[PDB]
Amino acid sequence: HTLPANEFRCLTPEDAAGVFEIEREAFISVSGNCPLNLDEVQHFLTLCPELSLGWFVEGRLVAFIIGSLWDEERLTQESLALHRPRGHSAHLHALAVHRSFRQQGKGSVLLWRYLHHVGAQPAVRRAVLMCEDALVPFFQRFGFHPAGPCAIVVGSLTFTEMHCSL
């Protein structure tokens, strides 16, 4: 009968478009590319929705995390578009908060809720992600430890890989 003020839930392929709209501003308007195009978003929300989490305010997505499982110690170029069902690492492909909702703790709240959420899952023993050097201290607040230059290439952007035990 109404739109919940605040709601945390895993995403579905139906949310793909909203997710991509946030990326267009959060990533594309910045570097000219984004972690996941519409097909890549749908792919993981189809294969491993349980590894996604979204924040909806008044029926609109304002924050999201989209992941999949990885089965190797370090992140590789191929891991970008893969889901390894046998893996034990929750690979965070993207984390973003709508432009009109940043710097209010939502991203940190979502990330903490996400770590516990995937950490509840039997297989998930570790969480991994890559980020630009400016965000390394941010993720260290969540237990992530920098693990050297990430092997992954994306345009002229370079990233630092980070691992967090769960």
Ligand X SMILES: CC(C)(COP(=O)(O)OP(=O)(O)OC[C@H]1O[C@@H](n2cnc3c(N)ncnc32)[C@H](O)[C@@H]1OP(=O)(O)O)[C@@H](O)C(=O)NCCC(=O)NCCSCC(=O)NCCc1c[nH]c2ccccc12
- Contact by Cβ (8 Å): 114, 145: no
User: Cβ of residue 101: shortest distance to ligand X, in angstroms?
Assistant: 7
Closer to ligand X at the Cβ: 64 or 87? Answer: 64
Q: Map residues 96-115 to x or -, x wherever contact with ligand X holds by CB under 6 A.
A: xx----xxxxxxx-------
The pair phi, psi for residue 30, each rounded to 5°, is: -100, -60
Q: Is 27 in the site for ligand X (CB under 6 A)?
A: yes
Q: Is 34 in the site for ligand X (CB under 6 A)?
A: yes
Q: Is 147 in the site for ligand X (CB under 6 A)?
A: no
First-to-last alpha carbon distance for the chain, in angstroms, is 38
Contacting range for ligand X; rule: CB under 6 A; set: 4-12, 69-77, 115-123, 128-136:
128-136
H-helix or E-strand spanning residue 22? helix 16-23
Residue carrying the six token digits 């893996």:
87
Q: Is 16 in the site for ligand X (CB under 6 A)?
A: no
Alpha carbon 112 to its chain's center: 12
Alpha carbon 82 to its chain's center: 14
Kindly list the residues in this chain that would bind ligand X in the complex (CB under 6 A): 26-27, 31, 33-35, 94-97, 102-108, 129-131, 134-135, 138, 154, 157
